[PDB]
Ligand binder design. Structure first.
Ligand SMILES: N[C@@H](CC(=O)N[C@@H](Cc1cnc[nH]1)C(=O)O)C(=O)O
Ligand SMILES: N[C@@H](CC(=O)N[C@@H](Cc1cnc[nH]1)C(=O)O)C(=O)O
Ligand SMILES: N[C@@H](CC(=O)N[C@@H](Cc1cnc[nH]1)C(=O)O)C(=O)O
Ligand SMILES: N[C@@H](CC(=O)N[C@@H](Cc1cnc[nH]1)C(=O)O)C(=O)O
Ligand SMILES: [Zn+2]
Ligand SMILES: [Zn+2]
Ligand SMILES: [Zn+2]
Ligand SMILES: [Zn+2]
Lengths: 389, 389, 389, 389
């Protein structure tokens, strides 16, 4: 016998496939971590040493891309005891996350981009796909090489920069600082082949999106590189976000915020307003703290976010909102890959990566493939982090 | 016999107690530097090896908290010969100060935060409680670690930052500098578990509080973290301070300034205006120089402040103003502890620290306990600094 | 009734006390986290609202002090996936550990003293007692303030410095760099009130202890500040370690190494050698990686150390080594506290901290108290880390 | 029909395979740039849309790996006009080179690691595989991040460091500087998953290898991380090089030097000396200047090295040296990949990268495949650099 096992041939048979586009019942051929063929009825013997998988009666869709996760831990708003813990592989996979963008938040004193970068690498090495944003809430940005442009341009996992605005925990940056930072990300992105975005954590300040508007009037960074996140945190901010998207910007809704605008609600609303789903993404904020502040900017309560809200949002949208599953998936898949220009991700096409979700019809996760590898079986991780126990 | 002396049991019997709230005649049980019980009639044998103290006919109240003292010396406005000297322990205790916040002023060239920090530690070790502010008049701030946020976040004794505005000795900072500095203090405070305030020395400039208003319009720092000090220095500034407090800010009156608005006068006025005492504090400016300047910003005269004005203010308020003692005490006790979130200080409650003042009925200090230890006896220090002589 | 609960009075009765010294049957009284009385037969009613614990039939001893723990995680010798996780509270308490000293190892790129410091602080807040060493294997040391000397003098929790010698992962330092470093720690120590020690991770190099000796002739740092650790990792090193202890040095044996010199064996050998137990300590290296390198410095195997070996060593010593329980506890209690000058630790005496272990006669942990708080009950943590699962 | 082209299936049939091991007549199947099967007689229809290549009568072997190439240009020893040009893709592929390691030489003023890195990245994108060494002749090293150790641990393409010793253009470094540097590369290597080697350009100094030996006694870096290059440049050096290899070291012979020790001659001598071929590598120094200096360190002659000598050496060895083709290829394939720990390179095994050469029986290159892509056809590049003419 001849051994063709190195190929990792895998045939995924007869699931109802959402690419996210409804492909109906379709097969998927995988080799070396890549989708090599997608079509109705694939001869299970088309290739040697092929592992056949019957997904009849099941749904197949692309793995989620969570562009907002505190991979190394976050928190700290109430002292050191509130420093959250690092993210563990199985937590991600089990929630259907095959691709992630790690970032830092409030604390950039006991939290470092070098550590975030190491964790990002560990995850890629463990089996999934991971990137990161340089910077943190603090502006000017705390980087690895000393320059935002140089970080985005030269650190392979860095794709953009993070900052915070309209929030009582910001560093009170002025327009110039913001503009420059954005411009540097923009430029380091062309050079490095990164999207070069700037992600803005939004707080509850009444100024809302103003800083983003000001910034626009003060530089030549395309509206397409700027991402306001946690837009559902408050009404008036949410409403502003809608017009921002309508002007051509993309807005990121956080799944970990149920009030005042719940995730599925925000998405449905966007759509009511005429916003194209391609301009709406959804992220978890996993492992970040969920601190609530007083009227005096006083902390009262503090929790930690998880990844389960992702899937839940989908379910709700489908289930309580009348979205088609296809539509329901976009913001976690194709919309995100689109905004971040994440190649080979977000869609089920030949040549793309074999990052797939096998779900039951009532949208429950059974299996997860990350780059062609079986990570989750029967809704449970079969592959765990080097130190998960 | 069994030895239970390690406990330092101390029963303080039958004084009329102001917590600052009028508790009438009440006893106070202390152990290991802490108030363990407060109630009418405590069995002098409730605990073993208990030291009983009869304060019948006397008043008992909490130790003062002076949040504005040049612990290492200050001055310098008229040359090196005008560099004031360091503060000595007994000077504090004798004036009823059991808790202090050290800071720097005009000179941050021959004066250093590292020195201030060492002195702060020496004082805690000698018997009282001491903290400090990083920075000085100079903006941008001269810190220990190179960053305001990092100092507040990581140096255990640092609780906030100092600066000067509306004064001919300021560094002429612009709104951005101010805003950022404040924001950094704010944020380093959450992380470090410090109040994270910004204290503004106010000069006589006609702009008065404007800079604070501007700052507000340019960042998201809660009005509750900003403290304008020496507000009584001039009328129009004083008047502005009143509305600032009324908007929700706290104002600090300096006891060492008799004109144009004397300390008790300012406090009474605040109250006439409807300001809650919780939003009014009083500090000494002890060891700082008291320089007076010309019309041409020319120095004429220069003196050095002491701590006796603290007690005097209380006396006057009670004596010439009709405040209840309870009310009279707030600004030196509960109001200060409240603003700085100084835990276990400012009030007489079980679990709080045994920082107490024993006074005669005509408000004269007889004894002082700092953390359960007898520091002053019969109005005189029994415990002196390592080098006091 | 009068409320005296703020005192947390606790009376631990009837156990067989090892302080570590054998004190036969004897009671212990606690108030405010401190030991206030130690005597046979204390009256269960000597003080109000007392919680009495019947320890009859049990054994009572000081909590362990582990001076070598990778609090924020370690490892990374085989890439990013081998970066070990941070330490959880419950894992320490459950191992009998009430005081700990945190440090960095091989990686000081993705690992930072600022993060280590935040963690040390987190643990102090959560209930135990933590300190840290500045630096890492890398010499020159990477510090918080930019100076070893400054780090030790001004960062409250820093008590000395870590470095690596005689190991293929060292930074190839020369005596000058080592001497200067040790001298800085010594001096910072005097200034800040710290022991100001230099901790040397020893590797398998044939040079063994040579560098230390060289350093001793190139400076005037007292031998008593120089701590070689992991001395049992190889024989010739171990034997050299005995001479060094013999000359006045203290030596730290790693409980996580079972070959070629088992921990209990090392201790017994030290003693048979005429080295007083005061000059022998034992530490775990918990959370650190346990990497194995072949012939050509190639990594063959990697694992993570836990805390169980601490206790095990004690059992073995008593059991197999003819040791008295008293002597057997020294190396984890009094010797350590003595070496690092840890006040209020390692010994059960009035005035010390209520850090104690309740064990069965066969040496199994049952209860653990930290600063008088119950952390472990029935061999199980009843107090957990803010983010423990 | 079903489309399976995303797979790039390619079946290379009938050649005489040297993997390098002689495997007689044997086929090779490729999919997605990887070798998925290696066996005699694979079925031309085993997989769909297969491109079958008749290599009958040819020879198939691994692509060459050149670890010493001045990718961005070099030279400059005789002023600015002698700065050599950057390497073009086609020149590498055409020389049989599929993997390359880039470095700097004498000039690190007009030459920068950031530029070298961009180039390495350009080549990876264009189709081959490239890595780089940080540093240059200059010691201390000029780096990207400011630290050798950091450069190696965090810049993905950096795998070690370059330096110059025993040469009149060295920076006159001392053992400490050398030892520290090598130790940093070693450690960064472990952290980032790199070999973490130190590459020593050797010059004609009488000191020859002394510095290496000195370094070995001043540190604990494994001999296997230390690569002396250009060892054939002079005799006594060369002879010393044999002893070093004999002690466990690996040695790099330069194909661009024909006197006094020809490349093929050096290799044969190494072997006759008992040095396994695994410890002998051969590199070109392509694009580097070939300067000649007279008596008094005066430049007499300058030229630029090409890549043709690589192949030539192989031919000569076989031809004139009694070598088997197998052995003759080691030094450019398996030995190199082995030394630098290059995974998926230097050997034709299922799972490795499809980097292969098609040669005539007389050893002339015909085709070249890189990661399964056809780059050279008929001895001519059919793939060129984005800006190649
Ligand atoms: N700050 C957290 C991460 C974070 O942004 N959380 C959100 C949670 C939230 C959003 N809206 C209300 N709460 C925040 O606004 O704070 C950290 O730094 O980990
Ligand atoms: N500057 C002094 C401390 C200080 O602020 N004193 C006050 C005294 C004052 C207030 N109003 C009039 N005089 C000042 O306004 O100068 C130093 O630096 O020691
Ligand atoms: N490397 C660890 C800390 C450390 O010093 N471990 C020792 C463990 C050991 C001792 N003997 C064998 N293994 C080592 O020699 O590696 C980290 O950095 O986490
Ligand atoms: N100098 C070159 C790189 C380099 O090391 N070349 C060797 C070439 C050589 C070896 N023997 C004779 N000539 C040198 O000794 O000069 C550059 O910097 O481009
Ligand atoms: Zn956020
Ligand atoms: Zn976040
Ligand atoms: Zn002032
Ligand atoms: Zn002052």
């Amino acid at each position: 016998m001849i051994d063709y096992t190195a190929a990792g041939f895998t045939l995924l048979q007869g699931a109802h496939l959402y690419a996210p586009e409804d492909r109906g019942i379709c097969d998927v051929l995988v080799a070396n971590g890549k989708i090599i063929a997608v079509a109705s009825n694939i001869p299970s013997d088309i290739v040697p040493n092929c592992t056949v998988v019957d997904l009849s009666g099941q749904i197949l869709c692309p793995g989620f891309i969570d562009q907002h996760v505190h991979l190394i831990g976050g928190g700290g708003e109430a002292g050191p005891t509130t420093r959250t813990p690092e993210v563990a592989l199985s937590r991600l996979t089990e929630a259907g996350v095959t691709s992630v963008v790690g970032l830092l938040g409030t604390d950039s004193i006991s939290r470092h981009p070098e550590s975030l970068l190491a964790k990002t690498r560990a995850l890629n090495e463990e089996g999934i796909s991971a990137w990161m944003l340089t910077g943190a809430y603090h502006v000017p940005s705390r980087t690895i090489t000393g320059s935002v442009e140089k970080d985005v341009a030269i650190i392979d996992r860095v794709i953009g920069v993070k900052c915070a605005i309209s929030d009582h925990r910001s560093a009170a940056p002025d327009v110039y600082h913001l503009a420059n930072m954005a411009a540097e990300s923009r430029v380091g992105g062309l050079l490095g082949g990164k999207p070069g975005v700037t992600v803005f954590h939004m707080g509850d300040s009444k100024k809302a999106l103003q800083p983003i508007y000001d910034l626009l009037e003060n530089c030549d960074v395309p509206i397409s590189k700027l991402l306001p996140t946690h837009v559902n945190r408050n009404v008036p901010l949410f409403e502003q976000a809608l017009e921002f998207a309508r002007k051509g910007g993309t807005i990121d809704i956080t799944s970990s915020i149920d009030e005042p605008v719940a995730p599925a609600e925000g998405i449905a609303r966007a759509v009511q307003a005429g916003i194209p789903l391609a301009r709406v993404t959804l992220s978890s904020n996993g492992n970040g703290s969920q601190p609530f502040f007083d009227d005096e900017g006083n902390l009262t309560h503090i929790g930690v976010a998880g990844f389960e809200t992702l899937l839940e949002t989908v379910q709700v949208l489908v289930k309580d909102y009348d979205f088609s599953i296809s539509d329901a998936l976009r913001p976690l898949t194709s919309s995100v890959a689109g905004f971040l220009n994440l190649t080979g991700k977000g869609e089920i096409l030949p040549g793309n990566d074999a990052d797939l979700l096998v779900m039951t019809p009532e949208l429950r996760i059974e299996q997860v493939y990350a780059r062609g590898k079986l990570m989750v079986k029967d809704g449970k991780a079969c592959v765990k982090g080097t130190f998960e126990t």
